[PDB]
Amino acid sequence: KSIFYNQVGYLISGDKRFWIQAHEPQPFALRTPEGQAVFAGMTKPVGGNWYVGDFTALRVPGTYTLTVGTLEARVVIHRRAYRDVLEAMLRFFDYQLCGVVLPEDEAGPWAHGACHTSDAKVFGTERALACPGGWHDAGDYGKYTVPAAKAVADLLLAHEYFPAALAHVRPMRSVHRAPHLPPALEVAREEIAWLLTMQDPATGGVYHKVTTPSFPPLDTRPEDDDAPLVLSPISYAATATFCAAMAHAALVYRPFDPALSSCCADAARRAYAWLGAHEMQPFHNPDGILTGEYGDAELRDELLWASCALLRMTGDSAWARVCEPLLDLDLPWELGWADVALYGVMDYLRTPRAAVSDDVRNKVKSRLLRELDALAAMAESHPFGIPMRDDDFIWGSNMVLLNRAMAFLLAEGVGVLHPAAHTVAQRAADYLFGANPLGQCYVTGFGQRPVRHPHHRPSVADDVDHPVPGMVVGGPNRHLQDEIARAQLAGRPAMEAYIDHQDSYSTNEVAVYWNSPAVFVIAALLEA
Ligand SMILES: OC[C@H]1CNC[C@@H](O)[C@@H]1O[C@@H]1O[C@H](CO)[C@@H](O)[C@H](O)[C@H]1O
Ligand SMILES: OC[C@H]1CNC[C@@H](O)[C@@H]1O[C@@H]1O[C@H](CO)[C@@H](O)[C@H](O)[C@H]1O
Ligand SMILES: [Ca+2]
Ligand SMILES: [Zn+2]
């Protein structure tokens, strides 16, 4: 029996809330560290056992003691409460670096030598290839094209939308090339550079992944993983998500790295030439390969994103001939990793009005507004005010929640101003930081109940005790898709289907595409 609140803190000019399981409204106070009362209010019902306490009006920064009943919590008010967590969430990408020496001056206890240096065999051939750099996908050391495209798309979007907030954070600056680009672009260049090695120079097709034939033991240090590396076959999705992320990078890097920008635009075109010459065939793990499949039977949403990305890159009206029919389909307007349509929607809507049908544009703008209203309706009925239903608590539910928060924020930039946008973003950060039924801070190294045992090979393998900070875990998953979850979590409601245990990969794994929308959301809150 306790207080559920944002364990990282609150913004001076932002919404401040706490939750408790109660039966009636209770008086509550916020005190200074000495004990003097500064704010007083009454709790109020929100659904079931849930009562809220809103202390938004308390604008004087500081470390306050919140008291309700006999319970006590330590809360923090600061003009930049989330800067530290944002910096850590952005440094996670530098911790995930493959084939790069991470020095102790930058990485501290989690420093290591260059891992996965050896070349990879192209599956079913004797041909080898060097595909170095990039990020280890998650808790495993695999490098997967499809989810990598989402991680890049998100960081580029965060820099485009919130560069002022991102300017206050510092990545592992000493491992990147000089002159130093803005923080998010410096971190994302590494993954973009790697992604280019994945494209077949012969055809323009992109390899789905570069992984060892199977998952090594959970206790493997990055440099001790020495099984042969295999390039899984070229896939439609890998190629289409690559084209999309590459054209986006071409626009963003134009004033910062013109050579990379040019290199990315040509790589996107060749990848689009591959799409029109090939069939929409889903990927399936070939015999022997037992690593993450990242499969998807629906590939029109990837074509939509790759077309719209090139439409925004070129600014050519000719591309709308291909976008506009795809924009008419009943595809889920989502932010990945498998349903990517919203990225295409965004790219289309952020293209000059002259190159698009003003009527298709309005229909697209209207669908998005209805989509936001549906997310807003869910948040209005959820006691934590998050656009979530019990059935949305799936594998990587924190990404579902963050992508939804991110959907509201992206829309603010294409004239779709929902009155719920900022509340939803605040509630999503509160949830992530401990305002959930488990009182769990879903980020490592932060809050009073941080994640101590994630499914992360460098954090399990090392003898440090504390895991790498700034890692966002998948979160509660009702399907119980691992032995530890099947064992400990049967019968538990959707939001409580989480376990802080290293073997629970379905609720406790970390990932590059789970940290990326967190970076967007946190930067949005700081900026506004
Ligand atoms: O479900 C597949 C994996 C999700 N990403 C990283 C992997 O570590 C997860 O996989 C499995 O790793 C296990 C945990 O040690 C090992 O037990 C298994 O034999 C793999 O399925
Ligand atoms: O758990 C994060 C990923 C670690 N590397 C291997 C991938 O299989 C893991 O991914 C997720 O895989 C799941 C199994 O197909 C899919 O259910 C999830 O939506 C992915 O996050
Ligand atoms: Ca898809
Ligand atoms: Zn590596």
Side-chain angles (χ1 to χ4, degrees):
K1 179 70 239 276
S2 54
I3 295 153
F4 302 89
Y5 73 111
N6 191 313
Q7 307 173 15
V8 169
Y10 305 88
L11 289 160
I12 293 176
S13 58
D15 275 45
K16 304 172 195 77
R17 194 163 277 203
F18 76 88
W19 286 253
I20 41 149
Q21 290 196 105
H23 306 279
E24 63 199 282
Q26 298 177 80
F28 71 84
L30 280 100
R31 302 159 202 281
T32 58
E34 43 275 4
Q36 185 85 316
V38 188
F39 189 92
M42 282 298 304
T43 67
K44 64 182 100 84
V46 288
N49 343 105
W50 305 107
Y51 272 70
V52 303
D54 184 277
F55 57 103
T56 305
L58 175 63
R59 314 292 197 188
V60 174
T63 297
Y64 297 104
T65 310
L66 157 65
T67 65
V68 52
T70 57
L71 301 167
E72 277 211 350
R74 215 91 133 93
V75 310
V76 358
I77 305 172
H78 199 280
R79 73 193 173 271
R80 267 192 310 277
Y82 310 131
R83 195 224 67 86
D84 270 31
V85 67
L86 183 65
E87 187 169 77
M89 280 175 180
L90 184 75
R91 284 163 66 79
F92 166 62
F93 292 97
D94 291 345
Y95 275 112
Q96 293 295 92
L97 284 161
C98 190
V100 187
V101 169
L102 285 182
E104 184 206 48
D105 44 64
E106 281 290 359
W110 314 280
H112 64 78
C115 64
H116 306 101
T117 52
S118 67
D119 298 337
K121 273 182 196 168
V122 173
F123 195 82
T125 88
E126 303 279 311
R127 195 162 70 259
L129 271 194
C131 307
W135 305 316
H136 289 140
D137 178 72
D140 69 333
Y141 299 125
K143 295 192 286 180
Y144 317 80
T145 306
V146 170
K150 176 187 157 60
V152 162
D154 294 339
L155 296 159
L156 299 191
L157 282 176
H159 166 77
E160 291 208 77
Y161 271 68
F162 325 114
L166 280 148
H168 296 276
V169 306
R170 182 206 190 268
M172 284 182 193
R173 204 155 277 154
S174 90
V175 312
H176 306 277
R177 201 174 71 246
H180 298 275
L181 305 169
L185 304 177
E186 177 155 318
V187 148
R189 191 170 48 191
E190 305 283 315
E191 193 73 348
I192 283 156
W194 168 65
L195 275 161
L196 298 163
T197 74
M198 299 300 275
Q199 190 177 227
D200 177 20
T203 53
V206 186
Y207 298 99
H208 192 90
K209 53 159 158 178
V210 50
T211 67
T212 63
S214 63
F215 296 120
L218 192 54
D219 214 52
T220 320
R221 286 190 178 271
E223 64 264 72
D224 300 328
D225 181 16
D226 300 284
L229 298 170
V230 185
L231 279 150
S232 280
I234 285 158
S235 80
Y236 192 100
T239 308
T241 54
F242 169 94
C243 171
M246 286 307 113
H248 192 165
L251 280 186
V252 193
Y253 289 87
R254 220 154 269 253
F256 297 108
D257 191 334
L260 175 81
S261 170
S262 176
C263 175
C264 278
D266 304 323
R269 283 203 204 87
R270 290 193 308 260
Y272 205 81
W274 186 97
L275 301 177
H278 293 75
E279 277 169 49
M280 293 178 154
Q281 165 64 50
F283 177 82
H284 288 299
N285 266 337
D287 299 2
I289 312 297
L290 307 153
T291 53
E293 206 181 67
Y294 289 106
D296 181 27
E298 178 50 73
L299 304 166
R300 288 175 294 176
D301 58 288
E302 283 72 14
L303 186 63
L304 192 160
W305 182 23
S307 321
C308 287
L310 292 170
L311 172 72
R312 197 168 69 93
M313 178 176 103
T314 72
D316 188 353
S317 47
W319 292 104
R321 259 204 178 184
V322 52
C323 311
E324 304 176 337
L326 291 161
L327 285 156
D328 178 70
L329 299 171
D330 249 354
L331 298 155
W333 281 8
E334 297 177 8
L335 298 159
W337 57 268
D339 305 289
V340 297
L342 205 61
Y343 284 100
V345 174
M346 292 316 299
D347 271 349
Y348 175 80
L349 246 24
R350 293 179 59 202
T351 297
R353 291 182 157 90
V356 311
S357 306
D358 272 52
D359 122 79
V360 174
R361 204 183 182 270
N362 278 146
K363 278 171 192 174
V364 161
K365 261 173 92 148
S366 284
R367 188 188 151 176
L368 178 60
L369 186 62
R370 294 182 315 260
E371 291 268 44
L372 296 179
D373 280 340
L375 309 174
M378 294 170 80
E380 255 268 58
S381 100
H382 198 98
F384 292 95
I386 52 156
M388 296 285 268
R389 259 177 298 111
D390 273 357
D391 65 76
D392 300 322
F393 295 92
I394 61 165
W395 196 320
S397 55
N398 286 161
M399 189 206 68
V400 177
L401 159 73
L402 289 158
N403 286 2
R404 296 188 178 168
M406 176 162 193
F408 284 92
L409 307 150
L410 286 170
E412 305 241 291
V414 291
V416 176
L417 290 129
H418 201 286
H422 305 286
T423 297
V424 162
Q426 183 59 66
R427 301 290 96 90
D430 302 330
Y431 179 92
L432 209 78
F433 304 153
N436 55 72
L438 296 168
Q440 186 69 53
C441 181
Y442 294 115
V443 190
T444 61
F446 285 90
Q448 282 66 78
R449 198 187 266 91
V451 170
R452 332 267 281 211
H453 320 285
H455 188 84
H456 183 62
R457 278 159 180 90
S459 285
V460 172
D462 69 8
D463 287 274
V464 172
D465 301 312
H466 280 209
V468 171
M471 321 191 294
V472 170
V473 305
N477 167 8
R478 81 206 288 275
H479 299 291
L480 319 169
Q481 304 156 284
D482 70 76
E483 32 82 73
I484 314 299
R486 263 170 274 233
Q488 310 299 113
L489 311 164
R492 267 149 203 183
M495 291 187 290
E496 290 165 28
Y498 168 79
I499 181 117
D500 189 1
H501 189 300
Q502 58 166 69
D503 293 293
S504 180
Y505 49 86
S506 83
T507 87
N508 220 23
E509 204 161 354
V510 299
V512 291
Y513 57 100
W514 291 354
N515 258 247
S516 64
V519 168
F520 189 94
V521 172
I522 297 312
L525 280 166
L526 294 171
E527 258 239 21

